[PDB]
Amino acid sequence: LVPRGSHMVGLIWAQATSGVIGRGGDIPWRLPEDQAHFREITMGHTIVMGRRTWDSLPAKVRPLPGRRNVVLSRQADFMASGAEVVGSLEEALTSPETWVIGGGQVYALALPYATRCEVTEVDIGLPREAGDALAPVLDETWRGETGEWRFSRSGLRYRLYSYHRS
Numbered sequence: 001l002v003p004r005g006s007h008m009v010g011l012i013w014a015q016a017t018s019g020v021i022g023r024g025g026d027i028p029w030r031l032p033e034d035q036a037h038f039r040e041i042t043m044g045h046t047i048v049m050g051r052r053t054w055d056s057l058p059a060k061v062r063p064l065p066g067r068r069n070v071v072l073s074r075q076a077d078f079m080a081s082g083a084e085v086v087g088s089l090e091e092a093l094t095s096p097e098t099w100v101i102g103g104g105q106v107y108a109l110a111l112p113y114a115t116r117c118e119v120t121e122v123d124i125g126l127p128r129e130a131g132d133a134l135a136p137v138l139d140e141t142w143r144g145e146t147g148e149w150r151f152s153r154s155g156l157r158y159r160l161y162s163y164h165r166s
């Protein structure tokens with residue numbers, strides 16, 4: 001349960017088994033089960049994303065519905081129609097429950113404040129290339145639950161992890 005006076009911070013991402021989450025301004029796969037899972041977890045809460053993740057969303061779909069959208073940027077002239085742009089995590093983490101939805105830079109930025117991670121891992125062989133966005137690495141203060149491999153309608157294995165710390 002989340003007390004309304006708290007500030008719970010979770011990270012949610014999908015990665016290949018290599019840890020790649022992003023390449024060329026996009027996610028280098030599509031997985032409907034992951035899209036459904038992402039929506040189930042985040043709906044009704046504030047979502048925080050880096051400016052490059054906002055850019056990766058088609059204009060027609062953003063801001064993502066049913067959630068307060070907040071975008072992190074250091075550029076004083078970057079604007080996100082329908083959403084709030086702020087310059088720091090201190091400004092972005094004011095709701096009782098916030099999901100940080102990417103990308104690589106913002107996961108690393110938010111990790112010190114996070115107590116939950118929800119991961120989808122896709123069994124697609126995409127080794128790391130220069131310039132890729134990568135999942136954050138989780139140290140021994142975290143404890144994880146790893147689901148068994150499941151099989152998507154699109155013919156990829158995937159599995160879910162849930163990590164927590166105090």
Ligand SMILES: NC(=O)c1ccc[n+]([C@@H]2O[C@H](COP(=O)([O-])OP(=O)(O)OC[C@H]3O[C@@H](n4cnc5c(N)ncnc54)[C@H](OP(=O)(O)O)[C@@H]3O)[C@@H](O)[C@H]2O)c1
Nearest residue numbers: 013014022026027050051052053073074102103104105106
């Ligand atoms: N598979 C997934 O789950 C997933 C999820 C989300 C995104 N992605 C993919 O990941 C990639 C994007 O990730 P990325 O690491 O390149 O960028 P990102 O983390 O989405 O955004 C980086 C931007 O956030 C701003 N930023 C970074 N640190 C900041 C700070 N301390 N304070 C204020 N603003 C800060 C900066 O914006 P300014 O340059 O405007 O200052 C920076 O350029 C894309 O390929 C995307 O498709 C994948």
Ligand SMILES: CCc1nc(N)nc(N)c1OCCCOc1ncccc1C#CCO
Nearest residue numbers: 012013014026027034035038056101102120
């Ligand atoms: C659904 C992808 C995703 N999955 C998990 N598990 N965590 C995330 N943070 C996450 O990224 C959400 C922001 C980026 O979204 C997209 N980026 C590129 C192409 C499509 C989408 C989409 C969508 C909604 O269907």
Ligand SMILES: [Cl-]
Nearest residue numbers: 038039064065
């Ligand atoms: Cl969505």
